[PDB]
């Protein structure tokens, strides 16, 4: 309820999964939808198409709030990084702007090594 | 608040539930679970007061109008759609039927004058002037339009037969005891309509459904009736499962803690027993060994019936090969062409919504109903086993279980291969003598499975097999069907049954009959 008319859409795209959370400008989540939760278990959730389904599903479960202006914040690498922004404009949402919030540490914590 | 006070019932020669007692009352919904053949509906009848226990008392509520739903959705077929609902209320229906002996008896006496004078007054008290006024509106509210109110109950699809049988219980109803409400499987739209209806209005309810998801979405308690008694766990269903499994593995663990703490005590008593310096110590725990008294482990009533369908004669080329049916009853034909082939495939799980006509399509295919004009034909070597949606014409004529199961079979000994197929599916000597017309639900379905196993047919029509099964017989039948090497059709509404094994799924609609997308997962994905 409360009819939020101006909100945010945090896209947390990873190598494995693409997860979309729509929230108001105060950072209080309304609804969320992921790539793997749309019947894309396994390697398929790491597909750009699975993000398109995830974004369109996240348009629902928040359509009652009547959000009209979005402020998308992309984050992280992955193939479901760009195909999901274009899936928010295809549901009628008006993206006011696009921002990238990706953590680039200034040589902070030591990274892992676990691949050979 | 209705209470059971040490209730026991003995059917045959072994008690069903031994000395049960529990309190029901409040805005809660005690859905109860149990393997078919073990209490459940009998306990519901005891609570309703229709049947009395062999020991114990109903301890009935004073005048609070227990409102009930029965297991049988076909027991009402002659009373009209507007008659069943008005017959739901006893004291009204009985007085109406007695007052109907006025226009049919052309003779009236002095006592009969008083009786007709006072029965009309009782009818007025019981609102007979609005008895049919309050019924049609409820029937329209549930979703049954006017056009079929005075029509007979026979000409109704069972998904709506249940829709009317539910409304039959909706007359000033506290304490509604609903028997198996699904079966004649609802689409799923009707199921969600049910769940919203049930969980919106506030009353005390007792559900007995076998549908885990429906019970999760509806109920708050679980009055499981499994081992020998009715034990109630507060939980929807996934709390009940993790309660009744953890509390049983705990029983096994707390019993192994005794079975293994007796072992080393016995090792001591066996080693230092004749020793003069330690005999007084061995005899000190040889007597605490026998004062432990481990707690016994009962037997669960849920079992997997071993059912296996063979093949008498293998046909090769193709089986069905239907061209044009165009079957109709009252409206424009429910379907027109339905040209298709079989090719000795598997299933083609016919499905739709309630009232489309899948059951009558299967009736036309099996030949007990013939189309308006068309040809079906089967292979000259085709042997057809049939599991009807409603099977009441079969369990009749008062035969024993043994006699019913022996009336089948081709060349088999009377003592084995027919008393063995019975024991492979949950039957014993104390049960092979009870009458056929008294078994309940899943047991009748299992008897039908047994007759199919002995007839060994090539083509299994099998309308709606998963109706009254245990949820433990469902997967047994699933495995039996997927290991069966013949040809079959079936119109089950279950999701992960068609999704489990279907290959040639055929949906049916008033306009477009789709056919064979694939796994039906691809069908539901394309849709």
């Amino acid at each position: 309820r409360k009819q939020v008319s101006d909100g945010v859409a945090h896209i947390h795209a990873s190598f494995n999964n693409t997860i979309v959370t729509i929230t108001d400008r105060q950072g209080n989540a309304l609804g969320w939808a992921t790539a793997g939760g749309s019947g894309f278990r396994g390697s398929r959730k790491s597909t750009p198409f699975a993000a398109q389904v995830a974004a369109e599903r996240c348009a629902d479960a928040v359509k009652e709030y009547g959000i009209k202006n979005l402020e998308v914040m992309v984050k992280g690498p992955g193939p479901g990084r760009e195909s999901t922004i274009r899936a928010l404009n295809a549901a009628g949402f008006r993206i006011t702007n696009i921002t990238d919030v990706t953590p680039i540490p200034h040589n902070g914590c030591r990274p892992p090594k676990k691949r050979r | 608040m209705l209470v059971s006070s040490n209730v026991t019932m003995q059917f045959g020669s072994k008690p069903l539930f031994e000395n049960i007692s529990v309190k029901f009352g409040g805005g809660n919904r005690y859905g109860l679970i149990g393997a078919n053949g073990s209490g459940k509906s009998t306990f519901m009848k005891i609570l309703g007061g229709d049947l009395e226990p062999t020991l114990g008392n109903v301890s009935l509520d004073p005048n609070e109008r227990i409102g009930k739903l029965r297991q049988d959705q076909f027991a009402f077929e002659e009373f009209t759609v507007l008659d069943t609902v008005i017959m739901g209320h006893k004291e009204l229906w009985e007085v109406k039927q007695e007052r109907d002996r006025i226009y049919a008896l052309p003779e009236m006496s002095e006592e009969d004058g008083y009786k007709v004078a006072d029965l009309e007054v009782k009818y007025g008290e019981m609102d007979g002037y609005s008895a049919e006024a309050r019924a049609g509106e409820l029937l329209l509210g549930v979703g049954i339009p006017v056009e079929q109110h005075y029509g007979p109950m026979s000409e109704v699809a069972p998904g709506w037969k249940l829709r009317v049988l539910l409304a039959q219980a909706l007359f000033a109803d506290p304490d509604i005891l609903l028997l198996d409400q699904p079966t004649n499987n609802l689409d799923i739209d009707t199921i969600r309509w049910l769940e919203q209806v049930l969980n919106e209005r506030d009353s005390t309810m007792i559900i007995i459904s076998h549908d885990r998801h429906f019970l999760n979405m509806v109920c708050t308690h679980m009055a499981d009736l499994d081992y020998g008694e009715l034990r109630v766990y507060p939980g929807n269903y996934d709390e009940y499962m993790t309660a009744a499994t953890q509390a049983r593995e705990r029983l096994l663990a707390d019993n192994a803690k005794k079975k293994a703490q007796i072992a080393e005590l016995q090792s001591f008593v066996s080693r230092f027993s004749a020793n003069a310096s330690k005999s007084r110590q061995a005899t000190s725990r040889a007597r605490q060994i026998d004062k432990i008294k481990l707690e016994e482990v009962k037997a669960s009533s849920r079992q997997n019936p071993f059912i296996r369908f063979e093949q008498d004669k293998k046909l090769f080329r193709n089986a069905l090969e239907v061209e044009g049916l165009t079957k109709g009853f009252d409206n424009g034909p429910l379907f027109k062409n339905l040209n298709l082939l079989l090719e000795v495939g598997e299933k083609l799980a016919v499905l739709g919504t309630n009232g489309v006509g899948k059951s009558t399509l299967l009736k036309t295919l099996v030949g007990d109903l013939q189309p308006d004009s068309g040809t079906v034909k089967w292979s000259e070597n085709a042997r057809i086993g049939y599991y009807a949606q409603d099977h009441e014409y079969e369990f009749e004529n008062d035969l024993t279980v043994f006699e019913w199961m022996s009336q089948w079979k081709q060349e088999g000994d009377d003592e084995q291969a027919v008393r063995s197929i019975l024991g492979r599916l949950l039957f014993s000597q104390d049960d092979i003598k009870k009458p056929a017309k008294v078994l309940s639900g899943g047991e009748k379905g299992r008897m039908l499975f047994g007759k199919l196993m002995m007839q060994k047919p090539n083509i299994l029509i099998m309308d709606q097999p998963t109706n009254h099964l245990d949820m433990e017989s469902i997967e047994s039948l699933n495995m039996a069907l997927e290991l069966y090497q013949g040809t079959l059709i079936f119109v089950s509404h279950d999701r992960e049954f068609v999704s489990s094994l279907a290959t040639r799924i055929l949906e049916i609609t008033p306009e477009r009959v789709i056919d064979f997308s694939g796994n039906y997962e691809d069908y539901l994905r394309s849709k």
Partner: protein, 65 residues
């Protein structure tokens, strides 16, 4: 990284802010530090860049084209 261009985009086309940080640091800082693998991959990095100058200086060939 931020693009406002308030009224007239209707289309992201923010490759200018996509080819600045996303490719390099993010998909590199996950592992492979080793404190001396970069110092030897760098020695090999333009042991071949100067090799192109020889190919740049290899313009004096006939090849009959």
């Amino acid at each position: 990284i931020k693009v406002r261009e308030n009224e007239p985009f209707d289309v992201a086309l923010r490759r200018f802010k996509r080819s600045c940080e996303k490719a390099g640091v993010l998909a590199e800082v996950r592992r492979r530090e080793f404190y001396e693998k970069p110092t030897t991959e760098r020695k090999r990095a333009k042991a071949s860049a100067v090799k192109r100058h020889a190919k740049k200086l290899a313009r004096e060939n006939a090849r009959r084209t």
